[PDB]
Amino acid sequence: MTSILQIALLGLVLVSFALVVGVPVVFASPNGWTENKGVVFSGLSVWFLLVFAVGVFNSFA
Amino acid sequence: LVDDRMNGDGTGLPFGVNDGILGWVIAGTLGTIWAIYFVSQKDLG
Amino acid sequence: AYDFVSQEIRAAEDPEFETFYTKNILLNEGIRAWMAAQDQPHEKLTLPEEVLPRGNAL
Amino acid sequence: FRFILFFQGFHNWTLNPFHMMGVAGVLGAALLCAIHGATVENTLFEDGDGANTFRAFN
Amino acid sequence: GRDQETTGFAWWAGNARLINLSGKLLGAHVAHAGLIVFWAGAMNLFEVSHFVPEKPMYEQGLILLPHIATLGYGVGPGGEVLDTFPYFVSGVLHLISSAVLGFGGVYHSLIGPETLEESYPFFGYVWKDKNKMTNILGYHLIILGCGAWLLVLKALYFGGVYDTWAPGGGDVRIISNPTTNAAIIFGYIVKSPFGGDGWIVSVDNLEDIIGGHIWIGTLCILGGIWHIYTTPWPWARRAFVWSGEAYLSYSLAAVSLMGFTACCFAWFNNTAYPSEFYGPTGPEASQAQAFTFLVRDQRLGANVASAQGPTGLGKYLMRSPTGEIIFGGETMRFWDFRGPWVEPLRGPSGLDLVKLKNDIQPWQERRAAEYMTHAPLGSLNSVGGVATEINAVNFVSPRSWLATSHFCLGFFFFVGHLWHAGRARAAAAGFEKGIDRVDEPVLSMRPLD
Amino acid sequence: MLTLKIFVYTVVTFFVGLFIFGFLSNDPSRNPG
Amino acid sequence: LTYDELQGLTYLQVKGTGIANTCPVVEQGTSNVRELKPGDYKLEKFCMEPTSFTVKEEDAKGREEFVKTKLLTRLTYGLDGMNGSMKINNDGSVEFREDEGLDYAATTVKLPGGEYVPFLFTIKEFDGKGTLDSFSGDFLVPSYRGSTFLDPKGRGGATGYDNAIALPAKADADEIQRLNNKSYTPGKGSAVFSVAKVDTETGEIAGVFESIQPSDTEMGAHPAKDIKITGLWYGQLT
Amino acid sequence: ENTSLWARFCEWITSTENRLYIGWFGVIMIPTLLTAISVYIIAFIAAPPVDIDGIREPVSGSLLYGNNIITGAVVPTSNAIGLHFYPIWEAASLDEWLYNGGPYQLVVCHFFLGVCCYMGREWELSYRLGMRPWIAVAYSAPVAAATAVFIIYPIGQGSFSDGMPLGISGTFNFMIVFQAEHNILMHPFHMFGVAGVFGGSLFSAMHGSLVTSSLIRETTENESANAGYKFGQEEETYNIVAAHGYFGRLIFQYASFNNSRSLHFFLAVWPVVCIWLTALGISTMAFNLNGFNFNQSVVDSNGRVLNTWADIINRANLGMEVMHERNAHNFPLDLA
Amino acid sequence: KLPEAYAPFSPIVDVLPIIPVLFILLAFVWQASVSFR
Amino acid sequence: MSLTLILQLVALFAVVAAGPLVVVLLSVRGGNL
Amino acid sequence: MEALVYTFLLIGTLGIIFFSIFFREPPRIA
Ligand code: CLA
Ligand code: CLA
Ligand code: CLA
Ligand SMILES: CC1=C(/C=C/C(C)=C/C=C/C(C)=C/C=C/C=C(C)/C=C/C=C(C)/C=C/C2=C(C)CCCC2(C)C)C(C)(C)CCC1
Ligand SMILES: CC1=C(/C=C/C(C)=C/C=C/C(C)=C/C=C/C=C(C)/C=C/C=C(C)/C=C/C2=C(C)CCCC2(C)C)C(C)(C)CCC1
Ligand SMILES: [Cl-]
Ligand SMILES: [Cl-]
Ligand SMILES: [Fe+2]
Ligand code: NA
C-alpha cells in the first residue's frame, strides 16, 4: 500500500495546488463565489477525503 | 567569622524582606500613599 | 598620543599600580606582536612562538 | 577593518584626542539628525484631516 | 479593499484601515494565526526530514524537535531518540490545521461580513464597549487556562515529560505530587532577578513547573469567568485609555516582557530546556570545561585541592564569596550553576573534596567533555567556537539562536508598546494629527517655561 | 547596615508609591485637548 | 553547628547563608583533654576558621603593636578538607602534621589610613610539636603570586618581560627590585594550637589557634608585613 | 480648585509652569539620577582600587589614586560577584563594598532606572504640551544601546565585570576586548550602526547646509544672518523650492524629498533604526553569536590555505585575545 | 528522516518553510497591482 | 542535476509562481483587489 | 595636585552648564 499512499499523496498535493490557486480567484471574482459554490465545495470535499485516505494508508502501511 | 553581614545574598527572599520590619514599612508607606489618594481621589473596588 | 609617561613610570616603579590605560597598552602590544608577521611580509618576521607576548592558559 | 585594528595596535588611535573630537563630532551629528527629525515630525501643525500627516504639506 | 482618500491611511499603514472593520479584522487575525500554525508544521517537517537520530539534536540546529522531545514523544533514557514518528505526526497535524485556518482567514477577509455588528451581534465589539471587550478577554483567558491544564494533564496522566534531573542521565518521568504550595509557587515571582535568584528563570524541579502551571491554569479560568461577568471598576475606567490601539499597546508591552523572559529562560534554564536537546548553557559549558580539566589533572597525579594558581587563588577549586567550594578560574562567575551531572558531587558546603576524588562516574565525564566541546559560541555563518577559530566546525547552539532572536523580538515589541501606546494616548486626546495652529497650548502658558 | 537597608526600602517604596498613585489620579484628563 | 548538623543540611539550605565558611564546632565533648586515648591517628576533616586579623605596625617609639583591620575578600578565608597525622602520647606529647586539602586562602585586609594588605592565610606542611594543652610549630608560606603571574606591565617570572618595555631608555639598576627581581622564595610562619574540647566517642577535637605569617611581598617588590591570625580549629582523628 | 493637599501636589508635579518639567516619570527620574550622579562623582574623584577580575588584582580608577580624566573610570563590579546583587547593606563594611566594585553596580542600576524614566518623561511632556508622542521612540535607541552595554552584555556573559567601565579608557578596553571575543567589526549589525552614524553625519551636514543656503535674505551684511529669523516668525524663512532644485540637480532629478515632512521623517528614521540594529547586534553577541567568520575560507587546488584580509583581522583578534586578561584564565577556552 | 513512504516527497518539505516569508512579498505584490492605491 | 535538486527547483518555481499567478488572474478577470 | 586641577575643570564645566540652564537669556518671540 506504499505506492497507493504515494499516489494518493500526490493527488492531495495537486488538489491543494488547485485550491490554493483557485479559492482566492473564486472569492475575489465579481459574482464568482455564488456561481462556483458547488465547484469549491467539491474541491474541499475531495481534498479532505484525500487527507483522510492518506491518513488511513499511513496507518495500514 | 571576623565580622557581621546581612547574609541574604543569593536567597529566594521575597522583595529581599529578610526581616518583617522591612515588609511592615513597605506596607505602611504604600498604604499611607494609598490612603492619601483614596481620601483625595475616588477609589471604589 | 601613545602613552602617559607619568603612569608608565609609576607602573614601572610600583608593580601593583594598574589602570585601564595599562591594560590597553598590553592589548596594543599583543596586537602588534601577533599581527606583524603576516601583516607586513616585507619585514620577513619569523618570530618564534616563545617571543610572542601571551597571557595565561590562552 | 584591518586598517582600523592596525591603527589601534600601533598608533593607539583611540587615546588620541583628535579621534576623540572626531568621534564626538560624528556621534553629535547623528544625535542632531535624529533629534531634529523626531522633533519636527512630532511638532507638526495639523494642516490636514487625514491620519497620514505627509499628505498635509504643500 | 480600500484607498487612502476614503480612509486617511496610506498603503504602508493599510491594516490600520481595519480598526473599525470587525469582520475583516477577524479575517486578518485568523489568517496570521494560520500563518503561525503553517510555519510550525512546515518547519517541524523540515527538521524531521533533515534529522539523523544518531547525532544529538543540538548538533543539527533543531529548535522545534527539542520542544516536542521535552514533552516526551519518543525519547529514551539519557535523551536518546527512539521514534521520530511522533515528530512527523505533530508536523502534519499543525500543517493541516494551518490549511484550515488559512481558508478561514481568507473567507473572513474577502467574502465574510466586513462589519459583524449588525448581522452577528455576539461578535460585534466597538473598541469602547468595556463589557464586550472584557467578555472577549474572558473567553480567550479561559482558552489559555485550558491549554495550561492540557500541559498539566500531559505531565500527569499521559506519560509524563522529560525530567533531566532524574537519576542517571535523565528520563521521561510521570510527575506525581506537583508542588501545589502557595508559598513555594508564588515565591518565584517575588524572587529577585539577579544572580543566585534568577526570578522565575531559576525554576529547577518538574514538580514546581507542574504546580505552577496548575495554579496558572486555574487562575486563568477563574479570571476569564470574572472578566466575563464583570465591567471594569470606575477607577479602572479613568486609569486606562479605551481604544483598539490602546489594547494593542498593552498587549505589546506584555509580550515584549514575555519575550525577554523567554530569552533568559532559554539562555539560563536547563530544567524546562534540557541540555540533552538544547545543548549546554553558557554556565554549563564553563563548568564542564573546568570539571574536565580538574579530572584530567587529578588523574595525572596532582592534588587539585591544594593546587594554587598563578594569582594565588586556586587553580581548580576556590571559595565562593559566601564560602561554598567552587570551580576556580573565570568560571567562578558561574558558581551558582546547577546541573544533573554535577549535583551528585556537591556536599552541604558546596563541591566535596572527597567526592571529587573518587565519586566521579564516567558518564559525568563524558557529558562534561561533550558540553565543553559544544559551548554556546558560534558565528553568524554558523562556525563553531570563539571568534578566533579555523572555520572548521559547523555549529551554533540552539540556545544562542533562541536567545538572540527572541531578545530582538522582545526589544522591537517594547518599541511597539512605546509607539502604539503614545499614539493611542494622542488620538484619544486629539493630538494625533498635529498642533491645532489656531489654539496652541503653548501659546496659553506663561513664558520662561 | 540594617538601618541603611530599611531607610532605602522606605525611600524606594515612597517614590514608587508616588509614581503609581500619581499616574492613577485621572492622568489621561491632564492634556490640553 | 556540629559536624552532623552541618552534614544533614543540603546544598540549597546552605548556599547563600555563609555557613560554608564556618568550621564545625564540637558540642558534646569534654574539656578534660588529658582523657584522650594515646595513639597515632590519621587526622582528617581538619578545618580552621579565623576570628580576627591583626597586622603588626611599629610606631615612632618602636612599640611594635598589632592593629585591627577590616576584611575585604568576603567569606573566602576558611581552610577545610585538610588531612594529616597526629601522635597523642601518654604524657600528652603531640606530633601534629598537615598534608593536604584546602590549606591556603588568599585574603586582603585593609589597615587604617587605607592600606591594602594581601596575604595567603595558610597552614601548609605545619609540623607541630608540644603538649596536648598547646602545641606549636612552623608551616610553609608560599609566594602570594605564582611565577607566571604578570604584573600590570607584563613583567614576571617564567612568563614575563623582565624589563619595563614602556621605557625603551630605562631598564637600569634603579629598577632592579621591580625588574627581574621577582623573587618567589617561600617563607615560613609560626603557629600555636590549643585543644579546647575532645569528643572521644566521635574521636573529634576542636580548639583555638594563633598563627603569625608574613604578608604578600608582591614578588619581592616591598618588605613583608607580619600578620597575626587567631581563630578556632576542628578536626577528626583516625 | 480642590482644597486637598494631594490634588495640589498632583497639580504641581504635572505643572507645565516649572522651569524643568517634573512628571510622574519625573518623580522616579530625579532621585535615581541624582543618586547615580552623586555616587559616580564621588567614586570617580576618590575611590579605592577595585578587584574587577576577581583575581585579587585591584584596578585603580579614581583621580585620588593617580589617574587623570582620560584613564580614570568607575571600575566594574568584581568577577567574583558575577550577576549577584551587591547593595551597600550586603557588604560587611564600606571598605569591602568599595573593594568589590559596588559603586559601579549602584550607578548602573539607578542610571538605568533614570534613563527609562527620562524616556517616559519625554513622552509625558509631549502629552502635556499637545504634541505627537514619538520623540521617546527616537530616544529609545540610545537607551537600547546603553542597556546593551551596561545590562544585557553582563547578563549574557554572566558577570557585571564584563559591563562597560564608566570611563574613557575603560570604554576603549571594552571595545577592544569585545572585538577580540566576538569579531564585532565583521558583524553586519555594527556594519549597520556604522552606516547609521556616517549617514547621520552626512544627512545632518547635507540638511543643515541646504537649509542655511536656502535661507532667504532678511538680514543684510554688517551683522550675522541669524538676526533675520525671529522666534515668533511663524513662517518659513528659507526657500524650500530652491533647496530641492539644488539637491535634485546635484545627483539626479526626481530625488524625492520635496516634502519637508518626508525629509524630516527620513532624518529621524535613518540613525534611529541603525542604532537599534547595532544595539541588537551588541545584545546578540552578548549571547555569543559573533560576526562572520571567513577564516581559512579560501583554499587552493591542493588544499593550502590562501589568506585573506579576514585572516589578518583574525591575527589581530588573536593578538587581543591572548592578552586581554593576563591572569584571569586557567584553561585554554575562554567560554565566559 | 521522514518515514520511508514519504521519502520521495522530501523536496516539497525542503521547500515548504519559505512560504511564510513569501506571503509578505505577495502582500507587496498585491499592493503594487493596485498602483499602491 | 540531482533528482532531488530537480524536484526542489520544480516545487520552488510552483510555490513562487502561485502568488503572482493568482494576482494576475484576478487582475485580468476584474476581481476586486 | 593634578587631581585638584582635574576636579576644578570638571566643577567649572558643571557650573557653566548650570548657568546656561538656569540663567539663560529668555527666548524672545518675534
Ligand atoms: C499576514 C499579514 C496581513 C494580513 C493577514 C492582512 C490582511 C488584510 N489586509 Mg493587509 N497588509 C499587509 C499584511 C497583511 N494584511 C502588509 C505587510 C501591508 C503593507 C504592504 C498591507 C497593506 C494593506 C493595505 C493597503 C490594505 C490591506 C488590507 C487588508 C484587508 C483586506 C484584504 C483584501 O481584501 O485584499 C484583497 C484580496 C486579494 C487581492 C486576494 C489576493 C490575496 C489572497 C488572500 C490570496 C492569498 C493566497 C493564499 C495562498 C490563499 C490560501 C487559500 C487557502 C484555502 C489555502 C485584510 C483583512 C486592505 C484594507 O484595509 O481592508 C479594508 C487595504 O487596503 N493591507
Ligand atoms: C492577561 C490576562 C488579564 C488581563 C489582560 C486582565 C486585565 C484587567 N483586569 Mg484581570 N485578572 C486576570 C487576568 C487578566 N486581567 C486573572 C487570571 C485574574 C484572576 C486572579 C484576574 C482578576 C482580576 C480582578 C479581581 C480584577 C481584574 C481587573 C482587570 C482590569 C484592571 C487592570 C488593572 O487593575 O490594572 C493593573 C493592575 C495592577 C497595577 C495591580 C498589579 C497586581 C499584580 C498581582 C502585581 C504583582 C507583582 C508581582 C511582583 C509580579 C511582578 C512581575 C511582573 C513584572 C511580570 C483589566 C482590564 C479589575 C477589574 O477591572 O475588574 C473587572 C479587577 O478588579 N482582574
Ligand atoms: C518569526 C516569528 C517567531 C517565530 C518563528 C517564533 C518561534 C518560537 N518561539 Mg516566539 N515570539 C515571537 C515570534 C516568533 N517566535 C514574538 C514576536 C514574541 C513576542 C516578543 C515571541 C515570544 C515568545 C515566547 C515568550 C516564547 C516563544 C517561544 C518560541 C519557540 C516555541 C514556540 C511555541 O511553542 O510557542 C507556544 C505554543 C503555543 C502557544 C500553543 C500551545 C498549545 C498547547 C498548550 C500545547 C500543549 C500540547 C500538549 C502538551 C500535547 C497534548 C497532550 C495531551 C495528549 C494530554 C519557537 C521556536 C518559546 C520559547 O521557546 O522560548 C525561547 C517561548 O516561551 N516566543
Ligand atoms: C488575507 C490577505 C493576506 C494573507 C493571506 C494568508 C496568509 C492566508 C493563509 C494561507 C495559508 C497558511 C494556507 C495554508 C496552506 C497549507 C496547505 C494547503 C497544506 C497542504 C498539505 C499537503 C498538500 C500535504 C503535505 C504533505 C504531508 C501532510 C505529509 C509530508 C509530506 C507533505 C508535506 C507533502 C495577504 C498577506 C496575502 C495580503 C492580502 C490579504
Ligand atoms: C506557571 C509556572 C510558575 C508560576 C508562575 C506564576 C505564579 C505566574 C504569575 C505571575 C503574575 C502574578 C504576574 C502579574 C503581573 C502583573 C503586572 C505585570 C502588573 C502591571 C501593572 C500595570 C501594567 C499598571 C500600570 C499603571 C499604574 C501602575 C499607574 C496608572 C496607570 C496603569 C494602571 C496603567 C513557576 C514559577 C512555578 C515556574 C514554572 C511555570
Ligand atoms: Cl581587560
Ligand atoms: Cl578560566
Ligand atoms: Fe529643517
Ligand atoms: Na589572557
Side-chain angles (χ1 to χ4, degrees), chain G residues 75-86:
Chain G
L75 299 173
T76 65
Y77 55 89
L79 314 183
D80 51 331
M82 295 171 282
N83 308 332
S85 312
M86 186 171 183

Side-chain angles (χ1 to χ4, degrees), chain G residues 167-202:
Chain G
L167 296 319
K170 182 180 291 296
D172 21 8
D174 56 350
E175 293 172 359
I176 175 181
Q177 191 174 7
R178 336 290 177 177
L179 278 59
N180 104 98
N181 281 18
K182 303 293 189 178
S183 62
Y184 305 102
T185 300
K188 55 162 297 306
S190 173
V192 180
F193 290 71
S194 292
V195 192
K197 281 186 175 180
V198 177
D199 198 331
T200 61
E201 298 185 349
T202 311

Side-chain angles (χ1 to χ4, degrees), chain G residues 70 72 106 116 145 149-150, chain H residues 48 55-56 95 100 326-327:
Chain G
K70 293 188 184 302
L72 306 183
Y116 283 2
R145 299 298 194 182
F149 185 86
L150 293 176
Chain H
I55 56 183
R56 313 302 166 82
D95 303 357
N100 292 272
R326 323 171 300 273
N327 315 307

Side-chain angles (χ1 to χ4, degrees), chain H:
Chain H
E1 49 93 20
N2 287 23
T3 324
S4 63
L5 281 77
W6 172 254
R8 308 177 185 174
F9 178 81
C10 291
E11 242 76 3
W12 176 75
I13 284 291
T14 49
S15 178
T16 54
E17 274 67 20
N18 294 321
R19 175 59 188 85
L20 294 184
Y21 177 73
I22 321 176
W24 297 122
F25 280 104
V27 307
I28 312 292
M29 192 198 78
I30 306 295
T32 57
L33 281 188
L34 281 191
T35 306
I37 285 176
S38 305
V39 179
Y40 178 81
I41 288 182
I42 303 180
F44 193 95
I45 286 189
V50 164
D51 181 22
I52 175 181
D53 288 329
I55 56 183
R56 313 302 166 82
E57 185 180 13
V59 174
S60 310
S62 57
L63 295 176
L64 259 293
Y65 290 75
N67 275 261
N68 53 31
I69 302 178
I70 298 299
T71 70
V74 178
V75 194
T77 318
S78 179
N79 187 31
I81 308 300
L83 287 174
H84 284 248
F85 196 45
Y86 199 50
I88 298 188
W89 52 84
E90 207 64 25
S93 60
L94 276 180
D95 303 357
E96 165 190 330
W97 180 73
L98 298 170
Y99 180 82
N100 292 272
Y104 173 87
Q105 191 167 124
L106 196 160
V107 172
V108 158
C109 294
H110 279 102
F111 165 81
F112 173 76
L113 262 28
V115 291
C116 294
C117 299
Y118 186 92
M119 181 168 49
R121 176 171 167 270
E122 276 183 346
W123 168 83
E124 194 182 350
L125 188 56
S126 74
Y127 183 63
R128 299 296 191 269
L129 294 182
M131 28 184 297
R132 324 253 301 287
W134 291 321
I135 301 182
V137 174
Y139 175 61
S140 68
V143 177
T147 303
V149 300
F150 288 147
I151 293 290
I152 303 305
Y153 189 74
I155 292 177
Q157 301 303 291
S159 174
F160 281 104
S161 157
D162 291 319
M164 194 185 76
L166 310 182
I168 303 180
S169 298
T171 291
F172 303 146
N173 181 82
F174 173 85
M175 306 179 76
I176 300 174
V177 176
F178 206 110
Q179 163 64 24
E181 293 182 312
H182 300 287
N183 201 343
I184 179 178
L185 284 181
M186 295 297 297
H187 198 291
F189 281 0
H190 195 267
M191 293 175 180
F192 271 109
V194 170
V197 283
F198 283 171
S201 304
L202 193 159
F203 301 151
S204 174
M206 196 73 186
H207 177 69
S209 50
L210 261 299
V211 175
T212 315
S213 55
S214 59
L215 187 272
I216 306 177
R217 176 157 60 180
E218 298 188 14
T219 278
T220 61
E221 68 179 17
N222 203 15
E223 60 177 353
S224 187
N226 299 16
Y229 181 83
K230 302 88 56 181
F231 180 54
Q233 190 187 43
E234 65 178 348
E235 273 178 348
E236 260 169 332
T237 179
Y238 72 109
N239 186 273
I240 335 97
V241 187
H244 163 74
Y246 177 86
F247 182 46
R249 295 177 181 91
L250 181 54
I251 35 183
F252 82 117
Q253 287 183 0
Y254 334 116
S256 186
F257 290 164
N258 54 325
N259 285 29
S260 181
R261 288 152 178 255
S262 299
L263 213 176
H264 292 81
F265 171 72
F266 178 76
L267 293 185
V269 75
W270 181 275
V272 163
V273 155
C274 294
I275 295 304
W276 279 341
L277 285 188
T278 188
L280 289 188
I282 287 295
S283 305
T284 55
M285 277 177 293
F287 295 108
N288 291 319
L289 198 52
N290 306 341
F292 291 108
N293 181 355
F294 299 127
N295 300 343
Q296 302 191 357
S297 291
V298 183
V299 298
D300 76 324
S301 162
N302 303 15
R304 290 285 303 273
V305 169
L306 307 176
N307 299 267
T308 324
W309 289 110
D311 296 21
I312 310 302
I313 299 178
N314 196 39
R315 296 300 297 177
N317 294 4
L318 284 171
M320 313 174 195
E321 174 77 359
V322 299
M323 298 287 299
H324 63 272
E325 294 168 22
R326 323 171 300 273
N327 315 307
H329 304 290
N330 296 12
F331 309 117
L333 298 168
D334 203 324
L335 305 189

Side-chain angles (χ1 to χ4, degrees), chain A residues 24, chain E residues 2 11 14-15 17-18 24 28 35 110, chain I residues 23 30-31, chain J residues 33:
Chain E
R2 269 300 205 282
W11 65 270
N15 301 331
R17 307 165 184 175
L18 302 168
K24 281 192 156 52
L35 268 177
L110 303 189
Chain I
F23 269 108
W30 157 57
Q31 275 311 306
Chain J
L33 314 190

